[PDB]
Chain A
Amino acid sequence: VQLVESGGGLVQPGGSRKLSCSASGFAFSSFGMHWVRQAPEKGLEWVAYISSGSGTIYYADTVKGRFTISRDDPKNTLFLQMTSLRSEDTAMYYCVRSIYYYGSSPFDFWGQGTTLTVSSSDIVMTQATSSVPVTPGESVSISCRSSKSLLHSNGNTYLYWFLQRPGQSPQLLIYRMSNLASGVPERFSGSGSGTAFTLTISRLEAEDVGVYYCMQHLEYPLTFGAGTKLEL
């Protein structure tokens, strides 16, 4: 699977810019698509979404109107048209793949991202921990405070743990706090009750060093955590 972004660089404030997310190596028309920004030395933040088959579009409440997202199914490319760009939009933009059915693992594969520098009521996910230096070979616990009870009536509590490595794209670590993603080692336990959520790492490795993002998927807009960095 491959997601390649294109269209970044230095953009004048107020100008328009189209981003092209070239998808390769999967059934593109059956995947909902996200954009997730990341400001320099700041947490992740959702931008926009298209449901599978271009049915149900969504945007973040703070960037509504300026961003126009569209999908090209024969060419397998996600377009993000941008107008009236402000100084807040200078960020790395990740093109995220997701799929929604029972037992599906959305937010599984993340694009490499594109750097775009601009010259010049929501469910708050309180990530109270900033950074804890842990010696490798030790069990690590990352807490996650949520403002709203994410336990839905049907049973599955919607919260996704991500790991972002330094110089790498973030990846799905755990989806719905009881289910490991395809390709993650069997060391990441999730335990969540109501609004309290806990990530447990049994054995810390050098690959596990990174920033952990706690993201709720109960209501739109999707809100990320501030992040919990590890330092070896």
Chain B
Amino acid sequence: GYTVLRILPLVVLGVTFVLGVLGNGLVIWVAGFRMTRTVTTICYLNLALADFSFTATLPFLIVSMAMGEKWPFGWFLCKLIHIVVDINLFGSVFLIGFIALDRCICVLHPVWAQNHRTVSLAMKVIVGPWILALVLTLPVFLFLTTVTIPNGDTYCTFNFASWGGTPEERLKVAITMLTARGIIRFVIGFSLPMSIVAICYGLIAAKIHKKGMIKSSRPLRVLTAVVASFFICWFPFQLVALLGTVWLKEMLFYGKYKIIDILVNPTSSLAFFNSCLNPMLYVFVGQDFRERLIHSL
């Protein structure tokens, strides 16, 4: 019961890694070098760049999770792997939001989406989500430090002793920074992009229903599957993360709410399983990319 709950993130995150490497490398080769650079394929390429470097930095995390939150790798490598996975997750979610808003502009107001939507504007604007992911990697770059335990353990979570000196003084900035981490995690990482994906795909589904272009079930199935893959994966993780953010004081001072601590690994692996399914769900549904894949290989 408890042991299979502990081992299930490793089981589904291994196949997340194995399918993610294949899918991301294939969608970064066939839509990176073989196809001509339009706007839709450059958004697919940049989500492939957000997702392939995510899947590349994943064996370090599965080794850390499998050992028991023990980090064998070096001091600088822990900070590097965590800033890379945080940049990649914020980039991946912001590019899911940007793809959804791009398709919203393409379907609702296609006059602007033909006139002003060009590949140069894609080049200029697509750096924006990455700069925002860099600024959102702020808590991770300088606060995260590998902690040495005299028992012999190597936990790499946080360290405030350098910043605030005495524990009593730095406890206030710790409980401030972690709840600010939770708020700026949720409000911009899930509250904004899931709402954008929801209202944008609702508006394009209402548009294609009002026009009556849906003669087959395929647009409704794919449009439903994107929202039922982005909501069934990130919301079990984000709800646990935000209940942990609010119940941080009870965990740090009283140490009572231990349900959130054990439940973060299956929900985190389920949130990574969206990244496992993003290349197929976004790019492989298109028949042009399928024909380009068969022509290439």
**Direct A–B contact in complex, judged by CB atoms less than 8 Å apart:** no
